[PDB]
Each structure stands twice: as structure tokens, then as C-alpha cells.
Design a protein around this nucleic acid. Structure first.
Length: 158
RNA sequence: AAUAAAAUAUUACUUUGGAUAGUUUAGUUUCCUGGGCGAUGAAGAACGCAAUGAAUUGCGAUAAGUGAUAGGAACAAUAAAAUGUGAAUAUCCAAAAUUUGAAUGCUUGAAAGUAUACUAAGGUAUAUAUGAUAUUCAAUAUCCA
């Protein structure tokens, strides 16, 4: 599966990717939106606090039936959750993208999560047995996750 | 009044999905030649057989093949062994051809079985109906001593 975007300078970027990951797309789509643009060190700390329910992931688009929380103040979103499984899956991709950067020879402290994208994947079907002799579907919602870490520098064009 | 988180709109890239284009060892129809099955056991069914096979294909206790005749150097997924002193391959031929099935000694459900005769095992034959011939008979049915 190809990447949504290519780095501006491949010499100063690192990539990680996962395909058909067995994690919910709607939860991971909100976790990736939270960590997009922050430094790699901060993004690793934020995802660890989501795990122990100390920073919230604001559910901005998929907020149907989600409850309100005290950590959702100032984010322009009244709803949030702490998706642990999607935080752990992104953490394994963030790590893999850092040893890829270390192998290249980039300063890890200067990296940032420039591009992270979540895509839908083919669902797996199961059986749920309903009343009056019916059978419904019990479908997973896997996803693809891309990740590009690029170094940061000041931009000036005269 | 204000924010653009959600919402909406366009383009590029990616994804879910498999339309479109190109293609065809498959079909459909018409015509030509035959229309060549079986008690010498058919069609159908079952089971079994490959060095590593489950299906399918081929084959039948001589098993993915035997002989003969043509044929001339391969097979392969891997390893063997054989091979111009003849490998693949082909056949209206020869041998061989498990259990059934018209199924036919008797029984048969998913049944394992079993009788007699001929030639301990193994192999043959013994259903019903029927034509011809031979042989043994039955009925005073007609004569008849």
C-alpha cells in the first residue's frame, strides 16, 4: 500500500507503516489527529498518557454517544475518550519510525510527526444470531497507518 | 458579535470497491460424416491403486500402468533409479480386467453371509421365460394283446 504523500527531502525523513492492523479505524483516526504536528518526543509522551487516562483524545467527528470529560476543555470539543489499543498500535509505529531515522543518521530530538494518515481496510465478517432465526454481521474495522517523521527548520524566502 | 472544531465545496495523492479498456484453451447456432452398447455381463454406482495426493485425471490386485507395433531423447515440485542393449508419446491390437449393477443359485439395510456339483483353498456352473435336439417319465387321453 502506497503512502498518501512523499517527503520533501527523503534524506531527512523516516517512514513507518502498518497494513490491515486489527484496531478500530474510528478510534485510531481520532488518535492520529491528536498527535499530528507535535514533536516525536512529545507524541511518544502524549500516547503514553492516553494509555493511563491522563490526556484525552478529542473525538471531533465521531462523537455520537461519546461522553463528556474534564480533560476536553480548550480543545473546542466537548467529547473525548482514551483509546488504549489505538494508542499502543501508533506507539509501535512511532518507535519503528525512529530507529529507521536513527539508522539514516538523523537527530531524533529534532524530528516531528509531519504526516500521519489512517485509511480504511477490508473488513472481516462474523455471525451474530438475532431473534426469529436471523443472522447478522459482526464485522471488524481494521485500518492502515502511515507515518513520516521530518526534521524541523526555520523557513525564510527573503 | 465572534471562532472555524464539526459541516460544506473543488483539485491532487492514497485507500475500500471492482466498473471501463485490451484479451480468450469457454459457449451458441447451422451444416457434413457416422449413429459403431449389453448374459463374451452394458450404462450407472462403490471401493481401491502414484516415492512423496485431498480433489480431479488415468487405471483395476499385472494399479497415474503390462506386452506388441509405431516413435526416437526426455521428466521435473523435490529426490531416486532406469535409458540409443531404446526415455517420453500414440493406439479400433494382445494380455489382464476388484464389489456391484439387467444382476441371473439363495439372502442382502448400512448385510456380516451361505448351498450344491465339477475342477484344503482358489476358480467355474446352478434365476425367470423360451426355440431345437436327446433322454427319463406321467395320464387307459386314443387304440390295443
Amino acid at each position: 500500500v502506497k503512502y498518501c504523500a512523499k517527503p520533501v527531502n527523503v534524506a531527512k525523513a523516516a517512514q513507518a507503516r502498518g497494513d490491515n492492523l486489527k484496531v478500530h479505524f474510528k478510534n485510531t483516526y481520532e488518535t492520529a489527529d491528536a498527535i499530528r504536528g507535535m514533536k516525536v518526543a512529545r507524541a511518544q509522551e502524549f500516547l503514553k498518557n492516553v494509555i493511563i487516562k491522563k490526556e484525552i483524545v478529542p473525538f471531533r467527528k465521531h462523537n455520537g454517544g461519546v461522553g463528556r470529560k474534564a480533560q476536553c476543555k480548550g480543545l473546542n470539543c466537548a467529547f473525548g475518550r482514551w483509546p488504549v489499543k489505538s494508542a499502543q498500535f501508533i506507539l509501535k509505529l512511532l518507535k519503528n519510525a525512529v530507529d529507521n531515522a536513527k539508522a539514516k543518521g538523523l537527530n531524533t530530538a529534532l524530528l516531528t510527526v509531519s504526516h500521519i494518515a489512517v485509511q480504511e481496510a477490508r473488513s472481516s465478517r462474523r455471525r451474530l444470531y438475532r431473534a426469529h432465526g436471523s443472522i447478522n454481521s459482526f464485522s471488524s474495522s481494521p485500518c492502515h497507518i502511515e507515518l513520516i517523521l521530518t526534521e524541523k527548520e526555520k523557513k525564510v524566502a527573503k
